Design a protein around this nucleic acid. Structure first.
Lengths: 63, 67, 140, 63, 63, 62, 61, 61, 57
RNA sequence: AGAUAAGAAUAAAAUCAAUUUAAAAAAAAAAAAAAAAAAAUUUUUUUUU
């Protein structure tokens, strides 16, 4: 979704990500791919407000 | 002001408040004695005569000199 | 019983409370065990039907039921110059200072100080922050 | 004087901008003249938007 | 300053204008006296208006 | 210009309705004038700031 | 005009101070400057002359 | 007024800051200019003086 | 450490006093405070505040 | 996640929690300068753009 997306690295449960930290502010759009079902892998970035969840587009244990 | 230049140098994310109390979240990108430009999601200019207070989210490095 | 409601996800933080105080209060006031999934639905682990109904009534009184719209008859509760704490529902005090109550001609709060007095009230301040505030129709 | 060239660039490109006043009101239109204390902006006709009364400006496109 | 000539053009054409004050008030009249700090109206009610309190102007007709 | 217009009001001792930026209305009579301040002899003497004034109108033609 | 504040300070007059926001304060001048006024009433405080809309005294001076 | 502000900064006095709006802020002076305050809080904070209505200290300087 | 010192007034835990407090002067180096176990003046003197100490030489 | 595209005008009447959010929670002195700027005594300076 434009105002933040649910992205699962694995499992049925879908974790949250938002317009800035999806793609480390490289774009103003929520996702550079801007496509549902798109193949780009996802893993967590460290930053975590207690009321926020972060699952950035990240491959190969980029960290 | 050197403080605003130091914030621009360290590119610290800041909370700016307006005189009406409206809260803007963004990183300051340019400043003149009338205005700041911050480019959070889209390029925006805010007038200093409309700003009430600014506070940084991260700590900001002391000027380490006499005021 | 293990009764369940598929209730709206967004109210989660307000059903738990900071420190879990409001969930602790709910469980102790209903004498009944509760799960409210952070993502998912509420479950109510109750000994018998009347205690389950009591828990439903209390959580329904704090789920959805947004107080934005026309005048409602709120109970004044605490009354002071710095505010009447007029509550239309549980855990929702419409803190209404004399500045909200009145403009131009103004008077000492004794002119309308009472507890539980039902009085006409609607929205005057709103935010995501839950600092939304209602006011007496005298604000007109 | 950061504002004056930015306003001139908007006037040069005649890009649609959202201007906000200090009172929180929005206006919309294209800058086509400015001076050190005023902006002339078209939605129906080119007209006065006083800079001291402006809180914020954000364009529809980068300039 | 190009603002004073714009106000003089309104005065020259004696155009009735809607002047909006920063407090969120419309006033109505015809542009008359003009100073760097203040504007007067030549309408039946002779208003003197502080430009620091002026937000925006729209005319009855294009200038 | 504002300064001579204010002097003319003071010369003609004209009662004016003063409007403040907050949306305040008042009515009064001139005691004196200043580049930053307006003084009124109506009721108790009032020092009204030029930065606070929105509008001024006379009750009688100046 | 200029010594009006000094005259109030000399007579130590309790004066109604009005801020643009419409708030009324009460007290006497402790000292005054082109940009700021410091008040004598209760605890001494600085009120920006820029923030002050009007001043009106309890008695004329 | 300049020395009073220096004394507040020297003595690290808690002050209540009020803006044009009904906000109340607690802090101490970190640095001061005729256009701005830098204020000690939970973090270092900037206040533009044109937004301030009054400042009142918890203890006299 | 160089950056500051952990200083005990009681049983309840007490965090790092920053070297910019510990030393008044420009230098701010561990040589000024290298001695372990030394008894020293310590007043937090702070309300509406997070845990800090205003010790200063 | 957006702020009324302006209430013809508040004799004047400080709004709750400004770091957020679910059981806290993460935690942070280097400071006089007495006005900023320009003319060269002045002026503007967040006391009328």
């Amino acid at each position: 979704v434009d105002f933040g997306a649910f992205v699962a690295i694995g499992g049925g449960k879908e974790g949250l990500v938002h317009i800035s930290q999806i793609a480390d502010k490289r774009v103003e759009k929520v996702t550079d791919y801007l496509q549902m079902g798109q193949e780009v892998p996802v893993k967590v970035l460290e930053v975590d407000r207690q009321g926020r969840i972060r699952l950035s587009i990240k491959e190969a244990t980029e960290q | 002001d050197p403080f605003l230049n130091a914030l621009r140098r360290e590119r610290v994310p800041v909370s700016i408040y307006l005189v009406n109390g409206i809260k803007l979240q963004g990183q300051i990108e340019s400043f003149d004695q009338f205005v700041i430009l911050l480019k959070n999601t889209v390029s925006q200019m805010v007038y200093k005569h409309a700003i009430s207070t600014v506070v940084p989210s991260r700590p900001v490095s002391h000027h380490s000199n006499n005021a | 019983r293990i009764h369940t409601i598929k209730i709206n996800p967004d109210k989660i933080k307000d059903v738990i409370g900071k420190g879990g105080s409001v969930i602790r209060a709910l469980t102790e006031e209903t004498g009944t065990t509760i799960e409210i999934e952070d993502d998912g639905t509420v479950k109510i682990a109750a000994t018998d039907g009347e205690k389950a109904k009591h828990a439903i009534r209390r959580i329904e009184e704090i789920t959805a039921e947004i107080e934005v719209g026309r005048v409602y008859t709120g109970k004044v509760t605490r009354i002071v110059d710095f505010g009447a704490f007029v509550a239309i529902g549980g855990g929702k005090e419409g803190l209404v200072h004399i500045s909200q109550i009145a403009d131009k001609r103004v008077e000492k709060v004794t002119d309308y100080l009472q507890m539980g007095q039902e009085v006409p009230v609607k929205v005057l301040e709103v935010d995501r922050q839950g600092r939304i505030r209602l006011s007496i129709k005298e604000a007109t």
